[PDB]
Amino acid sequence: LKIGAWVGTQPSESAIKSFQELQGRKLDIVHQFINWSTDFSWVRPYADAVYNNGSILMITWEPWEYNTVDIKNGKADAYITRMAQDMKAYGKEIWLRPLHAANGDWYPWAIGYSSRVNTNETYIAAFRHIVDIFRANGATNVKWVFNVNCDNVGNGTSYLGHYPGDNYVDYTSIDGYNWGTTQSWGSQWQSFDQVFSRAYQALASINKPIIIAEFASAEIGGNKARWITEAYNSIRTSYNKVIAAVWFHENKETDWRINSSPEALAAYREAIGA
Ligand SMILES: *[C@H]1O[C@H](CO)[C@@H](O)[C@H](O[C@@H]2O[C@H](CO)[C@@H](O[C@@H]3O[C@H](CO)[C@@H](O)[C@H](O)[C@H]3O)[C@H](O)[C@H]2O)[C@H]1F
């Protein structure tokens, strides 16, 4: 079980080192989010810091700038091609997670998104197109991460309708959160198992290893410290295809941070292990 995080900001050398110090352990995976108007030259100083630390960089690559119709039709290809050439030249093993949470309704490339422009077909053609361009440019170092949100949210969404095939995927991944009672829509406290079991059952049918790419717990509505202890136990005990757990450390929709309380931090430090 590799331990990773988005550390709440872009992973400069100091942000990586600070989070490592905070959690009392090596970060095996450092997570970054970038959009589709960011070139690799902007990524480079962060990647150099990650690799100099001896970590793997996972990039969630968010095309706010191009929907799946745009992408499948080649309208982003200059930008994709430059990224693939630059990543190949860089040479280091990078985990790339494009077009994530497509079984939700909140990103403009997602199948559930309310413009209705993204379908299983446009999504798969888009994802395959990206991978084809990277392979054409020799970027064998880039490992492809397929993703689902823990719940299917929005019309038309499913765990695998948008799956582009094992020939296009190195890892699958699940994101999900215990929102506790924090959201006025009526969120409730959920254990790790209540959050993740359904998505895991669907992905466990695919012969690829699984990453928990984004997860955290709120403080409100239950005991976050115990939730952390029990979540890592659950991962190790019953989610055996999961090979990495990548916390989402940011005080954002709620205080997802590992140090949202002293008790949560103590639990996290213990749970992640040696
Ligand atoms: C996983 O679920 C999270 C909980 O709901 C949600 O907050 C995450 O949203 C993503 O959050 C990251 C970090 O806040 C954003 O990162 C920003 O990405 C842009 C590139 O698009 C960067 O330029 C910027 O520096 C990053 O902070 C994501 O945009 C956002 O989708 C969700 F992924």
Curated annotation (Swiss-Prot):
In the N-terminal section; belongs to the glycosyl hydrolase 5 (cellulase A) family. In the C-terminal section; belongs to the glycosyl hydrolase 26 family. The active site is at A101, E214. This enzyme catalyzes the endohydrolysis of 1,4-beta-glucosidic linkages in cellulose, lichenin and cereal beta-D-glucans. It comes from Acetivibrio thermocellus (strain ATCC 27405 / DSM 1237 / JCM 9322 / NBRC 103400 / NCIMB 10682 / NRRL B-4536 / VPI 7372). This is Endoglucanase H. Disulfide bonds: none annotated. The chain holds residues 31 to 304 of 900 of the full protein. It comes from the Bacteria. Residues 15-268 form the GH26 domain.
